[PDB]
Paper text:
The asymmetric unit contains two [name] molecules (labelled A and B), and the model for each consists of [name] residues 2–134, with residue 1 (serine) originating from the genetic construct. On the other side, and linking β1 and β2, α3 and a short α4 form a helical loop. This loop is orthogonal to the β-sheet, and together, they create an open and deep, mainly hydrophilic cleft. The Zn2+-binding site is at the base of this cleft and is primarily created by residues from one side of the β-sheet. The cation displays tetrahedral co-ordination geometry typical of many Zn2+-dependent enzymes involving two nitrogen and two oxygen atoms. Two histidines, His68 contributed from α4 and His123 from β4, co-ordinate the metal through NE2 and ND1, respectively. The third co-ordinating group is Asp75 OE1 and the fourth is provided by Glu7 OE2 from the N-terminal tail of another [name] molecule (molecule B) in the asymmetric unit. However, while data presented in this study clearly demonstrate that [name] Asp120 is critical for enzymatic activity, the structural alignment with Ply500 indicates that [name] Asp120 is pushed away from the metal ion relative to the equivalent Asp130 in Ply500. Indeed, while the closest Asp to Zn2+ distance is 4.0 Å in Ply500, it extends to 7.3 Å in [name]. This difference in conformation is potentially due to the salt bridge formed between Asp120 and Arg34 of the adjacent [name] molecule in the asymmetric unit and further compounded by the presence of Glu7 also from the adjacent molecule, which forms the fourth co-ordination point with the Zn2+ and would prevent Asp120 moving closer due to electrostatic repulsion.
In vitro assays then establish [name] as an l-Ala d-Glu endopeptidase that cleaves the cross-links in bacterial peptidoglycan, and site-directed mutagenesis is used to demonstrate that the chitinase secretion controlled by [name] is directly attributable to this catalytic activity. A mutant strain of [name] devoid of [name] was found to be impaired in the secretion of a select subset of ∼10 proteins, including all known chitinases and chitin-binding proteins. Available evidence suggests that [name] relies on its partner protein, the holin ChiW, to gain access to the periplasm and that this is the only role of the membrane-bound ChiW in chitinase secretion.
Author numbering: 2 to 134
Write the structure that this text describes.
């Protein structure tokens, strides 16, 4: 399937899941698709209130306030060789690409890999300070 694909990028998949995300975060993620050594898609951009309420009931978030609800966050999924991976190092590499794109665009993007506790690789967001909501 992917033997003749000299540079593997999940552009179309990512663009679809970026619909409704804040245009400034979209711009950063689209640029990061160009830079990342690790192919990735966006697994979740906009999240519904009902899904957030479900997370709060189940305990995977403390609050109904989420940057995903308003368009200010994405979760990425690493797709090395077209196969989903949850391994940390892939997300570290993705974050290099995101950080470079972000910098080029003049926008700070926070990465869940730099959360003070319970670090997790998929999450990127625009800051509350820069992009209040
Ligand atoms: Cl930086
Ligand atoms: Zn997230």
């Amino acid at each position: 399937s992917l033997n003749d694909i000299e540079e593997i990028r999940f552009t179309a998949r990512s663009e679809e899941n970026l619909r409704g995300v804040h245009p400034d975060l979209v711009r950063v993620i689209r640029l990061a698709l160009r830079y990342s050594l690790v192919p990735f898609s966006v697994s979740e951009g906009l999240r519904s209130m009902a899904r957030q309420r479900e997370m709060v009931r189940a305990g995977s978030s403390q609050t109904l306030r989420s940057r995903h609800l308003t368009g200010h966050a994405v979760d990425v999924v690493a797709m090395p060789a077209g196969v989903v991976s949850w391994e940390w190092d892939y997300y570290a590499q993705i974050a290099v690409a995101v950080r470079r794109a972000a910098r080029e665009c003049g926008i700070i993007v926070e990465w869940g890999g730099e959360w003070k506790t319970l670090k997790d690789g998929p999450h990127f967001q625009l800051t509350f300070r820069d992009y209040p909501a």
